[PDB]
Design a binder for this molecule. Sequence first.
Ligand SMILES: Nc1ccn([C@@H]2O[C@H](COP(=O)(O)OP(=O)(O)O)[C@@H](O)[C@H]2O)c(=O)n1
Ligand SMILES: Nc1ccn([C@@H]2O[C@H](COP(=O)(O)OP(=O)(O)O)[C@@H](O)[C@H]2O)c(=O)n1
Ligand SMILES: [Mg+2]
Ligand SMILES: [Mg+2]
Ligand SMILES: [Mg+2]
Ligand SMILES: [Mg+2]
Lengths: 364, 364
Amino acid sequence: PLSAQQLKKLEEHKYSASGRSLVEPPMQVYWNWLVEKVPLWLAPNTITMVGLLLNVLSTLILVCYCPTATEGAPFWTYLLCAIGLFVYQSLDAIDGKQARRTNSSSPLGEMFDHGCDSISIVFVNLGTIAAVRLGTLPGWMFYCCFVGMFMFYCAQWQTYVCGTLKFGIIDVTELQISVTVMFLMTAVCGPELWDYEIPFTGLPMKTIPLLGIIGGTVYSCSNYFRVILSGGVGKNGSTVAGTSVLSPGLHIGLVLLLALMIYKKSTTNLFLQNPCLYTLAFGFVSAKITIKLVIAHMTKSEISLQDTAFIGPGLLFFNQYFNSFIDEYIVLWIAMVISFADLLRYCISVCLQIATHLRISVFR
Amino acid sequence: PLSAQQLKKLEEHKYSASGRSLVEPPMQVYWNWLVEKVPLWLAPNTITMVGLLLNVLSTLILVCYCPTATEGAPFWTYLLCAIGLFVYQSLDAIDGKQARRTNSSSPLGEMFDHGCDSISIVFVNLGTIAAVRLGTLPGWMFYCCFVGMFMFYCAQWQTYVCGTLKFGIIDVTELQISVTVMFLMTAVCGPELWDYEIPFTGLPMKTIPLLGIIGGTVYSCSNYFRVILSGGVGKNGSTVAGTSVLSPGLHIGLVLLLALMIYKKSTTNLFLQNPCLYTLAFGFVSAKITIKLVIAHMTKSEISLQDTAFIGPGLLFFNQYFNSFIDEYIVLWIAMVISFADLLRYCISVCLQIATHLRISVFR
Ligand SMILES: Nc1ccn([C@@H]2O[C@H](COP(=O)(O)OP(=O)(O)O)[C@@H](O)[C@H]2O)c(=O)n1
Ligand SMILES: Nc1ccn([C@@H]2O[C@H](COP(=O)(O)OP(=O)(O)O)[C@@H](O)[C@H]2O)c(=O)n1
Ligand SMILES: [Mg+2]
Ligand SMILES: [Mg+2]
Ligand SMILES: [Mg+2]
Ligand SMILES: [Mg+2]
């Protein structure tokens, strides 16, 4: 999975990040106080795995009770989702702090952190789509999920063009806090709160989050794109690996364009009837693509545009080309299963290789 | 177009071929007698260019008077085709002999010979399809043209796996002689000769050539495939370049499979109504692919499966995917023009680079 030269360049890697947000000081104090009361013999990898597992299980439960994201759910699911998200954020901060001390830092930890972040953001966007019941506005339904995916990939990609993480003021902390408080408010008030049309403007309440999200969208994009153009660390304005500046753009554009092309020619309402399956399959594809870029920018190697991850999308596209010989409901399940198995195999193989080389005992 | 190392390996190349056919001695004596009466100041490249030009012009005239390969043509076209084919064979033998003497041999000459052979075999197969009026048997119409293309590519490919050309007993000489005599017989007797159903077996006369061709087909394939499997020249049974044995098979399979896939889902009789345009576009594609393999096996480099020659087939495939927004008659013309321009540009660039390096003055 990893070549000898690339693995050799993996060592002597120094993690670096600069930036601060508005709510950073108080939550920072809280996380510091909580990490003073953590057991000393616990490994950070177990912490991040536990956090990701809790978040995934809770979001999966919420999705299972709300297919198509247009029905209602009890307070049980919303409360569990809020608790899981809060615990995920807390464990992220705590295992970061505990890995920074007691000389347990390793390059595999950052890889685990980034992969967990990808999966968690996909599941969080699914949960916040299902909770608000955004099935009454079919126009704004592709955009939300796939713009969350696109923004995470763009953050990784602008990190590729530079050497240090740059943190803004509207970063993940505020997003997670807002989503948690929104889940709590929906649980306490009921799923019909977003059907409490505001006495003016003739628009429902669901426009209040969405518009803001769009605003944040633009803002985030702005920053990222600047680092794409003005930023340069190598011998020129090119990437740190010496390759072209806009290579990952082709990967993300291919994924999103292929998703849109399959969506627009379904002829049987493939997406508006099975949104969770569609989003999960393409989220696994995008998660593998993002992990590849994470590994690429940890080292100084180069990425290609030929992967054994377009199997599922390829099957969908070639089953759409021929008119119909397999109904477009089992093909989606096959694609999701293939993508999940491929991502799991890739992650397990890379983790095993790194553990064998550095004799880390990943879980210890 | 040619890398420095590959161009350096181009030099110190020795042409080698072994084999003999049944009719080789008499035609060999004739060609020797004719080359004793050739001017000494004429370059072989001009000879092969003249032969290819005559063959192409005559076949183009015959095709223009017989679109769809189901109408009749005057004796003028058939006589011109027979004369052009005979002159092409004669000039091939003569310029080969004249290049072998008077120290004018160069690696560019073999490249010209192979490219001319590719174009000539494509046009000869079109001419023999049009002359026999094989439009009354739509089942056996894809097979003929594309099996001619496939056989030439397979001959080149088995040459790739070894170092020397192997000549059988049913080689190009007998094919050309048979086609010439068939053109002469059709001209003297008329296009209706193939509508003179043989008093027995209840089959028309056009089965007499076709079956034989099929037989020859199998025979040729046999020999080639043996060299594909038993043959080995490098450190192992692999190719002389050290790469995989069955890499060009992917190229030829992609071309033929894509042609068949576009043919089988035309919905408007794209091939059975415009056979000459279809065959010419895919013949230009296959000619460029074959020239690439010729250059590869002249040197010891490696070929890829990513070319700027699938533009035309890509446009056809993606215009078929979307139902129809451009009628499937201008797209074919665009594809043919693009393929022809690409092949001409590639050939001109390679010829200019070789002439600049070796200061040959190609035409002199
Ligand atoms: N399981 C883990 C998680 C993080 N780490 C390391 O600990 C550092 C602290 O990360 P963090 O979570 O505080 O930082 P951010 O989450 O803000 O990116 C990471 O950059 C990794 O190098 C680790 O070694 N093992
Ligand atoms: N225009 C040409 C044609 C052939 N030649 C060379 O002359 C040799 C004789 O080829 P040939 O035509 O007698 O052989 P075949 O046609 O049987 O392959 C070729 O192998 C080339 O090396 C050349 O230098 N310039
Ligand atoms: Mg962390
Ligand atoms: Mg994290
Ligand atoms: Mg010759
Ligand atoms: Mg020749």
